[PDB]
Amino acid sequence: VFKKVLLTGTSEESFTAAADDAIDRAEDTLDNVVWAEVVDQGVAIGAVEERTYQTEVQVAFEL
Amino acid sequence: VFKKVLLTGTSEESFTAAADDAIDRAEDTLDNVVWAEVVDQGVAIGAVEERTYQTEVQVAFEL
Amino acid sequence: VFKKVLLTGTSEESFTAAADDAIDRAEDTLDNVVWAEVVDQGVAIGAVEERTYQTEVQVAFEL
Amino acid sequence: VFKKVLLTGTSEESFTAAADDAIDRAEDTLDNVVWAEVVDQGVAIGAVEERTYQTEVQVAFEL
Amino acid sequence: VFKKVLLTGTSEESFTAAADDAIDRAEDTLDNVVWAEVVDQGVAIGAVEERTYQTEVQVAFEL
Amino acid sequence: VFKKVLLTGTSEESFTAAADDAIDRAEDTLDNVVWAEVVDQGVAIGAVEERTYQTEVQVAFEL
Amino acid sequence: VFKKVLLTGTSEESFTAAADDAIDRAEDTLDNVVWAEVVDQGVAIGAVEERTYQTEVQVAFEL
Amino acid sequence: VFKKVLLTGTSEESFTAAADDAIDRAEDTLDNVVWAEVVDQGVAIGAVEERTYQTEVQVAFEL
Amino acid sequence: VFKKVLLTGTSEESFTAAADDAIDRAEDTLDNVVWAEVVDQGVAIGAVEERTYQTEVQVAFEL
Amino acid sequence: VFKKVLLTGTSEESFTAAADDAIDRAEDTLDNVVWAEVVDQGVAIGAVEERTYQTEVQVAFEL
Amino acid sequence: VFKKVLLTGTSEESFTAAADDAIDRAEDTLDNVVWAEVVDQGVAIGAVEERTYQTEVQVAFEL
């Protein structure tokens, strides 16, 4: 059985690096992370000193 | 990194109050709740004594 | 077996009350109404004297 | 010909009142506003002193 | 309030049995499981000795 | 001209048998049933003694 | 309250004429037809002597 | 950079002519119109003396 | 078994004629073409001397 | 690099068996078939002597 | 109230840089730009000397 957690990673560099930020956090806290699906992307501008790319992923892990 | 939980709030009064019901529960159990996105709305009729509005939200919190 | 009818309720007060308007009409004419799913919301402005909220629902009833 | 503008209204009271907030602004600045379609709803929590309902609408006006 | 977990069940027999695999796991670990919604189906071929049906479900439980 | 009715079939055995349950009911009551499209699938757990598969179909018939 | 019926019109000439075919049938059988929304278009080739355009519409009428 | 405006053209003749009605208006008022994407189609019946086809397009122009 | 090819037809006359352009090409090169589903429509303006309607279809053929 | 072909399998028995029918055909004609994603399901009634389940899959293979 | 403009940025380097191209143009011409949502990505090949990445964003600004 696989389970997914819905995480939004952030990066001041790129959408790819924002995806990695989410996956890194999943791997810190979960065993058997197997894949991620991108479900949304966006950019924070107003509330941040530097433009911040965000990539939201469903991160799948095996139970 | 943000994480989302998928909750359905309920209310005998309105869709807005059903959204609040979900968010209230998230805030009882989670720190750093930052926003909610509505993803579905509906109404329970058959199994309830009073019509019950439901609002399903992804509730985002900062990790 | 359940069957659904696709109804748009209207209200000069709220989206919740427009949903109720549709469900009320279903219950006038159908037995065993069990639930409703919201599928669209909108607001009439041009053709009405007062802004009118509309909520479209699939209303499910048991056959 | 109709044209639509994509506006997000806000309210500390309800999703219906947030829709009205957007439509009010359209009517301040545009002639011949005819209807609005709801396209998204959400709730601001983290950055606001009071929970704030948001309703995003395409507001249609006749050219 | 209901909460949903996003699980992918697997089966060498059918999509129905893969849905049951996910629901069985939810019931092992959660109280008050009330319903499941199918959100995706697929088939593993390359990495498995036998074709494996997968059914992804949001499994709802009452809090 | 074809017309569609939106029906949810149920079965304690499979999603295929739940689709058949809906189509059977359409054929009891309608002439010239020609095809069905699956639009949703789910599983009832909380309110039923046995897990019950549901398959919702648009059932098309020729007028 | 408005209600919609889901009809597929057909034409050997165009998608517009197929939409009209559905609406014509609705007007034969229903009072107060007010609008139609196109929800699908396609073309029959295999089972027909002449290519046949199809346009599926939700046809709304006032109750 | 391209920008899009969301316009609904109308025609008493066809969906193609309704698309042209929107594009014509864009070209009256904008330089460097490059393409249009159809995003919705419908038919006005209740409020018009003659059935009126509508085609909604995102009309893209180069800045 | 049916297979689909994803083709975009073009026409200086109409969306219906653009659909026919795609289907004609499929029939030139494939046996047993059975139906087509419209999946997108658009209009070329910038790169063409005359406005050009495009209709994208999945064209199904029996293997 | 993976490539997908869009196939509709058929079966007089079940949606699972219809998926297998498509995958079997892909494996007859392609090397390195790795997975399939279900994208649609339906049932043929009018043109067939026996109800026929159909399952449409994108079948992925490694190039 | 927030308003969104629908812009397609372009870049010969990456999808992230194409998003920035759109946002840069919004900031040249608008006050109070607060966020951007990615809604589409693509690549120009035929009409350009160098492959050109495009990222379409709704860019939100506060009124």
Added chain:
Amino acid sequence: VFKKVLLTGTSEESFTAAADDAIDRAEDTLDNVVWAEVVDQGVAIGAVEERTYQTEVQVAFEL
């Protein structure tokens, strides 16, 4: 007439480079490649020694 092939490119570096991987393969094997549309993105983790970005594109070519 344009035709599209549905390809998933892969890269150990970025989503942009994964899109290029797919397009490169299309250009190896097809004449008159004109554009690509991104339709999905994801990340392989479990089965690969290094995290691998994937970008799925419809690659359009002129017939």
